[PDB]
Amino acid sequence: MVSFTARAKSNVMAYRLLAYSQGDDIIEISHAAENTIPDYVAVKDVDKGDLTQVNMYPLAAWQVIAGSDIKVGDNLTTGKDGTAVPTDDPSTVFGYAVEEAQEGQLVTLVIS
Amino acid sequence: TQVIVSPNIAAVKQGGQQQFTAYVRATNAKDHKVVWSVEGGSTGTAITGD
Amino acid sequence: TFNDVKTSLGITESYDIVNAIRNSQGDNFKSYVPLATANNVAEVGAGILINQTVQNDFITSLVDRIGLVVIRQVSLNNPLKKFKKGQIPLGRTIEEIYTDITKEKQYDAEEAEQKVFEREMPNVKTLFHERNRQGFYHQTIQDDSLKTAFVSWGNFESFVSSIINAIYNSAEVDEYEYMKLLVDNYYSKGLFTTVKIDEPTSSTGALTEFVKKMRATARKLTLPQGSRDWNSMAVRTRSYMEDLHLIIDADLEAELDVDVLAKAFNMNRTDFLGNVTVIDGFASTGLEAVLVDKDWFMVYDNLHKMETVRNPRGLYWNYYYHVWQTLSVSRFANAVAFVSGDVPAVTQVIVSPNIAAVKQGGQQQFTAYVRATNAKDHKVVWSVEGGSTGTAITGDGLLSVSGNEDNQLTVKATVDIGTEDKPKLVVGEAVVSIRPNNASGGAQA
Amino acid sequence: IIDADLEAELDVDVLAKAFNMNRTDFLGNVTVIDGFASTGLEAVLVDKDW
């Protein structure tokens, strides 16, 4: 994979959808805003001032926290706190569920 | 009556995975979908639907 | 390493028996009030997972070591392995040959003047079987690491062998499942001689009838004189009561044992419904049970041995127990399926000399055996396909080769059941190659 | 493991059991007890290594 250094700027939690921004000579990361398309997924807790890395790779699927109950095949978007939630507005869809998840459980997703 | 979770004892290194299996000792009524969850300190750290 | 460990980790407690005893007031639990250590017996009895190191009762500094290690020797067996045959090291295919009986001629010395060297062909049919399942059992035993968990080689070695035994269990259990598969497969192909029964898991009358049908069947199967109606071939054969086996779901088995007294009376008798092998339920729907002659199974061992390899870096051994086997089923030997609910009027038409050959211009008589689930005689229609020439077959199943073609004729025995709008054309098939003859002819007269 | 009262009821009313009164090919090693204290617990069937 291709790794690079990035700094959290707001208490990154594991399995949350992440977004990024241009910071002080470094890419800064945080939980993705509600109702959008995320760029990266957390797989480690990284606090507000903590420095970490990002492992680049065209992953087939992500495992993220379900922000609500999810049915197999549901199109997903970002929700509160960077969780993944069911939707129906194409422009905010970043992937879809291949398995059932209850709120708070991990849900595997396939990118689109 | 009871739900038996697979490896009672696991040892994940961090970033690793462990498939757990539930054996729901129902009795008659075929109850189904088991809700998986996990408790811990550092945030994140979670279990898939399966 | 653990710390905050509960004694009741995964315990879905119904009620606190300790408190039940503590608050006992003339109730059943009063019987445990006389006990001295009941509280502890209950608290850490009934098991206990994880392991929380316990300090010595007298000297708290000291800890109590494990007094006994119990390495379990549980072994699983294939309830069906008694149907296995021998080993097949070299080669892959097994040819099963079965002859047959042949009519009866009348003594006639006068006739015999010219009929010496009459020439009478044998009625031999064969089946082929071949190596099928080919798998292996993979285990890692990181012995050097395991050693920290033991204090004696006796226990250490015992543990390691339990792993090896588990491999054998894995193999033997899967073997079972594949043999089970053979039964559901043969059934799925309509090859068992089927018996229509009403859902036995309903009325006790159905259970009673079920038993009677099985008994009737078994007696026919072992009827010394032989029979051509209990297998997937047209051959006449027979079974022995001790060779018949009943493959049946434990639930139904229990229903029968309890409700049918004849079954109860002979629950312990192999001369009643043959030997009985109680199993878990069949994958097939209506297939309630199978009564079968042990020779029906054509299960041979092929390659099977354990390979090992040492990982010098990870200090561990991999074990690869291979199990290659020839699992199969004979169409000879008798076998009956008891099918609940809906059944076809005809399950499987069988045609005599399935594999046949004849000289150009010759003829061959065929016989069809309609495996009906009733006695309504659903009528066979003889047909032949591949006839590039006027080659044809008579209405009695008599194939008559034109005298010049050779196109591996398909002989069919069609039985149309149900309405003609849904013509359920059950078809028995056979194939006939044509040996060159080139006899003079063209048209008779 | 079964109490004598239920055991007697079964012996008399169920003929299959009566026929196999002392047979471990029918059920297990029937051992009669005083009775279970737990409400609703009628009988248990266990492996000797339990």
Curated annotation (Swiss-Prot), chain A:
It is found in: Virion. It comes from the Viruses. Homotrimer. Forms a super helix coiled coil in the homotrimer. Belongs to the phi29likevirus major capsid fiber protein family. Protein that forms the 55 capsid fibers. These fibers are not always present and may have been lost in some lab strains. They may enhance the attachment of the virions onto the host cell wall. This is Capsid fiber protein. It comes from Bacillus phage phi29 (Bacteriophage phi-29). The lineage of its organism: Viruses, Duplodnaviria, Heunggongvirae, Uroviricota, Caudoviricetes.
From Swiss-Prot, chain D:
It is found in: Virion. Homohexamer. Homopentamer. The prolate capsid is composed of pentamers and hexamers of the capsid protein. Belongs to the phi29likevirus major capsid protein family. Assembles to form a prolate capsid shell of about 54 nm in length and 45 nm in width, with a T=3, Q=5 symmetry. This is Major capsid protein. The chain holds residues 250 to 299 of 448 of the full protein.
